[PDB]
Amino acid sequence: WTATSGSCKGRCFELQEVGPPDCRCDNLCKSYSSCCHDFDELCLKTARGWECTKDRCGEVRNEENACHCSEDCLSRGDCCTNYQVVCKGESHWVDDDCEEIKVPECPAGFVRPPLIIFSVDGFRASYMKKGSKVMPNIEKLRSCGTHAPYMRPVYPTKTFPNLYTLATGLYPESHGIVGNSMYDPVFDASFHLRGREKFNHRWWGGQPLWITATKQGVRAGTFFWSVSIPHERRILTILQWLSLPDNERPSVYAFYSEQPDFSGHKYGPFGPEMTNPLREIDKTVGQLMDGLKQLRLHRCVNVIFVGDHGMEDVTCDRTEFLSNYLTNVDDITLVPGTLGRIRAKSINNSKYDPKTIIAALTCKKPDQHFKPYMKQHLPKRLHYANNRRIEDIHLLVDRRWHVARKPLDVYKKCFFQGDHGFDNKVNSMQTVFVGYGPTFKYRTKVPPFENIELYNVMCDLLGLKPAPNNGTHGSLNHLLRTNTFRPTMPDEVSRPNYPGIMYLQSEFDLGCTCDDKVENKLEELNKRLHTKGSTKERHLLYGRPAVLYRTSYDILYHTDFESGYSEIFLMPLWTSYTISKQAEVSSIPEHLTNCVRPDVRVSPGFSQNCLAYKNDKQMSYGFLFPPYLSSSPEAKYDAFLVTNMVPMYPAFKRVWAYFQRVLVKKYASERNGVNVISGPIFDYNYDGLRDTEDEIKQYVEGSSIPVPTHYYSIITSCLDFTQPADKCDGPLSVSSFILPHRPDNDESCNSSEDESKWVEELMKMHTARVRDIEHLTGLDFYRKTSRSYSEILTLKTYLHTYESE
Numbered sequence: 159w160t161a162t163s164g165s166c167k168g169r170c171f172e173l174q175e176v177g178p179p180d181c182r183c184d185n186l187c188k189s190y191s192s193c194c195h196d197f198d199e200l201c202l203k204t205a206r207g208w209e210c211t212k213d214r215c216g217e218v219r220n221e222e223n224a225c226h227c228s229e230d231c232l233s234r235g236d237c238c239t240n241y242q243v244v245c246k247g248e249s250h251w252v253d254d255d256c257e258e259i260k261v262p263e264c265p266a267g268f269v270r271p272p273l274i275i276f277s278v279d280g281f282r283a284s285y286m287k288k289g290s291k292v293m294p295n296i297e298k299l300r301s302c303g304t305h306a307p308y309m310r311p312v313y314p315t316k317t318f319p320n321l322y323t324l325a326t327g328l329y330p331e332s333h334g335i336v337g338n339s340m341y342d343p344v345f346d347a348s349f350h351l352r353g354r355e356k357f358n359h360r361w362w363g364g365q366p367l368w369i370t371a372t373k374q375g376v377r378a379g380t381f382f383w384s385v386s387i388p389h390e391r392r393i394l395t396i397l398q399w400l401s402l403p404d405n406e407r408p409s410v411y412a413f414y415s416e417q418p419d420f421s422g423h424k425y426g427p428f429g430p431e432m433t434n435p436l437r438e439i440d441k442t443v444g445q446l447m448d449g450l451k452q453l454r455l456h457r458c459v460n461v462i463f464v465g466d467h468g469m470e471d472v473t474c475d476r477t478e479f480l481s482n483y484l485t486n487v488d489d490i491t492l493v494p495g496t497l498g499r500i501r502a503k504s505i506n507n508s509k510y511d512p513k514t515i516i517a518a519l520t521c522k523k524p525d526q527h528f529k530p531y532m533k534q535h536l537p538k539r540l541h542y543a544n545n546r547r548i549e550d551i552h553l554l555v556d557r558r559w560h561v562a563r564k565p566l567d568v569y570k571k572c573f574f575q576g577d578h579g580f581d582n583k584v585n586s587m588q589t590v591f592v593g594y595g596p597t598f599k600y601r602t603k604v605p606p607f608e609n610i611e612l613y614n615v616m617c618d619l620l621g622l623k624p625a626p627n628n629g630t631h632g633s634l635n636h637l638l639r640t641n642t643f644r645p646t647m648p649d650e651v652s653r654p655n656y657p658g659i660m661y662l663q664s665e666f667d668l669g670c671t672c673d674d675k676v677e678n679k680l681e682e683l684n685k686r687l688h689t690k691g692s693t694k695e696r697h698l699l700y701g702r703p704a705v706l707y708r709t710s711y712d713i714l715y716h717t718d719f720e721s722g723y724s725e726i727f728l729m730p731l732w733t734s735y736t737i738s739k740q741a742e743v744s745s746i747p748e749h750l751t752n753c754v755r756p757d758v759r760v761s762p763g764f765s766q767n768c769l770a771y772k773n774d775k776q777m778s779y780g781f782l783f784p785p786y787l788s789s790s791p792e793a794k795y796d797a798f799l800v801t802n803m804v805p806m807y808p809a810f811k812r813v814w815a816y817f818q819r820v821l822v823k824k825y826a827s828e829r830n831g832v833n834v835i836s837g838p839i840f841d842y843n844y845d846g847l848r849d850t851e852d853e854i855k856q857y858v859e860g861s862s863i864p865v866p867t868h869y870y871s872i873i874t875s876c877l878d879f880t881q882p883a884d885k886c887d888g889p890l891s892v893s894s895f896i897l898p899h900r901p902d903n904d905e906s907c908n909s910s911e912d913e914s915k916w917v918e919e920l921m922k923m924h925t926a927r928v929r930d931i932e933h934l935t936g937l938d939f940y941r942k943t944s945r946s947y948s949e950i951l952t953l954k955t956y957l958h959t960y961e962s963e
């Protein structure tokens with residue numbers, strides 16, 4: 159109940175929201191149907207419009223107006239945004255030349271530049287260039303401030319997941335809003351857009367910027383606006399708040415626009431109907447900067463023009479229906495649209511088997527436009543699994559398509575022409591970022607970056623300490639004039655051992671063999687220096703990775719590669735080697751196909767054995783440094799050490815071999831040498847973090863050799879490719895993958911064909927950031943370069959997406 163029999167006189171758009179039975183006057187009260195009886199009268203005045211005219215100048219203050227052009231309207235803080243243009247001969251902000259803001263120019267009593275977040279729903283990144291002629295104010299923000307060509311949203315590219323990610327810096331699996339629609343089995347509650355359950359706080363995890371601000375003594379305007387409140391009224395309310403007394407005045411504000419998302423759904427991303435919404439948004443920005451100019455706040459506020467996601471072309475006729483794939487389609491609940499999430503309809507159905515459902519959806523139609531996944535098998539770059547609200551079964555939908563349950567769900571719910579939600583690396587889902595103010599840089603373009611990074615920056619601009627989030631704090635310092643946060647490198651926690659020759663061949667009883675006994679001092683001191691590290695500078699280009707947890711591991715040096723070998727996991731954590739453009743691929747000689755060699759530096763007890771692989775009919779093995787890439791016949795025998803060996807399903811060896819035999823050399827010659835760091839990953843609880851020894855769920859049968867869930871590689875080279883990867887002066891270039899270690903290739907529908915037709919497409923799908931691998935390995939890379947650490951942080955968040963323009 160709400161007693162609407164109170165008043166809002168003086169309380170219009172109050173900042174401290176009251177609770178029932180007191181009627182509300184806050185910018186959200188209509189969404190609760192809770193406002194006082196006179197809220198519309200007193201707070202949403204519409205009389206005479208939103209602009210001044212000449213004949214209104216110097217008028218007699220008539221309080222019924224939506225805004226005022228009376229001579230006293232400034233001291234009251236409530237002029238129309240164009241008042242000083244019409245009445246005082248001044249200029250619109252957009253008509254003023256671009257002028258560098260070298261220092262904040264704030265009025266007295268402003269303790270810091272305020273931050274205004276101007277968020278636009280569905281603002282596809284390409285709008286910045288394609289719509290530039292009809293958005294003059296935004297183009298001035300973009301070109302004078304700091305901008306990226308696009309900003310990568312989080313998956314799913316949906317409204318609530320991305321708005322809350324912006325506000326928290328957290329992947330949706332951590333902050334809990336993993337769709338616009340969710341079922342939580344622990345609550346037995348549902349989150350929808352229709353209803354009041356979404357207003358309950360048990361859904362919203364982490365700590366958003368407004369809580370973070372408040373907890374640290376910075377006041378925040380209330381970020382959310384009920385739909386009915388006109389944009390003009392939101393802008394003015396923000397301006398009014400900026401005129402409050404110093405002790406009352408918030409320091410961070412938000413504006414939200416439903417456009418161009420709303421129209422982009424009806425008319426598609428580039429419908430002719432889309433010019434006008436882009437014009438209007440720009441007008442809204444124009445009113446804000448005009449109103450800031452009237453407040454002498456236009457070279458003092460920091461403004462973030464930011465989108466939540468893009469918009470793709472989608473029509474009802476491009477819909478895949480599960481009724482054509484399954485028989486008993488009523489035994490499942492499907493969350494539909496641009497992604498699919500399947501669970502059982504009834505919790506008391508023992509005939510429900512997710513395996514038969516995944517199988518009935520796998521490569522069934524020749525060109526089918528979605529692909530089923532168990533969520534732990536999703537590309538680790540999406541980080542979309544570690545939450546009970548994410549159903550076990552997931553459908554990744556090709557851009558431009560939908561997935562539905564039965565046809566009747568599409569025609570009893572054509573209509574729309576735009577949608578979003580797809581994979582967050584799709585070009586159409588990319589959105590915008592622009593920063594403008596004294597704390598941003600001037601006329602500076604910065605590379606694309608992920609929106610999980612912004613929360614740390616907004617904390618910087620506001621002087622706040624960020625709650626723990628998934629940003630990499632300092633990877634965006636190159637957007638800032640000042641307030642850059644200077645991080646130190648994490649300290650190494652385990653130091654390695656450097657073992658020498660300590661065991662004899664006969665101490666090993668591993669079941670391996672090698673046709674190698676067909677073995678000079680003119681080059682025997684040569685191979686001694688190799689095993690002590692004489693060539694480590696060629697293959698460990700950016701220093702060894704630091705182990706950020708407590709474990710026992712050895713550094714092993716070889717002519718062609720160095721490893722960091724773990725006695726706890728009986729395999730390297732990392733293996734590092736450089737391949738120049740000149741390097742030649744070689745075969746595995748016929749006599750060495752089944753060669754595996756004891757490593758006289760590592761005890762038998764801390765070594766894999768070959769019998770375990772003979773006995774496990776499902777498991778085979780591979781090598782981290784590839785034998786194909788040896789530098790000489792004599793070096794090749796090092797690639798066959800038991801300490802270079804890792805467990806691999808035969809189906810994954812198809813993939814892994816083609817990467818080592820073909821792609822590494824292809825990349826060496828395209829990029830003028832590459833340095834490659836490879837290794838295993840264990841993520842059996844799909845939380846994106848390195849498993850501990852007691853969390854392994856699978857071993858090579860009859861052994862303590864743990865089976866990785868993934869294999870990674872980090873391919874580095876010189877950004878200026880006219881310098882070899884091993885003689886690089888300047889910035890670096892990187893790509894990486896986290897490949898799922900799976901016993902089939904069902905993810906790849908074309909895997910019955912030659913590896914040249916499918917393997918690299920799979921690797922592209924599972925591209926990763928270096929940062930992602932660090933979470934999964936406890937390793938810290940790039941510890942010793944010539945570059946600045948901030949630059950190195952940006953590199954580690956770099957993601958290579960293989961998208962066009």
Ligand SMILES: O=C(c1cc(OCC2CC2)c2ccccc2c1)N1C[C@@H]2[C@H](C1)[C@H]1CN(C(=O)c3ccc4[nH]nnc4c3)C[C@@H]21
Binds near residue numbers: 321
């Ligand atoms: O008022 C805020 C708001 C603003 C925020 O941050 C704005 C600030 C950053 C600048 C938030 C931040 C974190 C959490 C919630 C937030 C809510 N909304 C009001 C609308 C929108 C955001 C929510 C989703 N929605 C839709 O009607 C809708 C729109 C497009 C769609 N497409 N497909 N389905 C769709 C459904 C109803 C709610």
Ligand SMILES: *[C@@H]1O[C@H](CO)[C@@H](O[C@@H]2O[C@H](CO)[C@@H](O)[C@H](O)[C@H]2NC(C)=O)[C@H](O)[C@H]1NC(C)=O
Binds near residue numbers: 333628
């Ligand atoms: C993303 O950031 C969050 C916050 O640091 C991480 O989540 C925390 O993880 C630890 C370990 O599981 C828990 O004790 C905390 O309760 C978690 N907090 C939240 C809010 O989830 C999360 O692990 C990070 N993800 C990645 C991939 O690094």
Ligand SMILES: [Ca+2]
Binds near residue numbers: 840842843850
């Ligand atoms: Ca884990």
Ligand SMILES: [Cl-]
Binds near residue numbers: 314316337338339
């Ligand atoms: Cl959704």
Ligand code: NA
Binds near residue numbers: 775
């Ligand atoms: Na075998």
Ligand code: NA
Binds near residue numbers: 903904907908909910
């Ligand atoms: Na296949």
Ligand SMILES: [Zn+2]
Binds near residue numbers: 280317419420
């Ligand atoms: Zn939308």
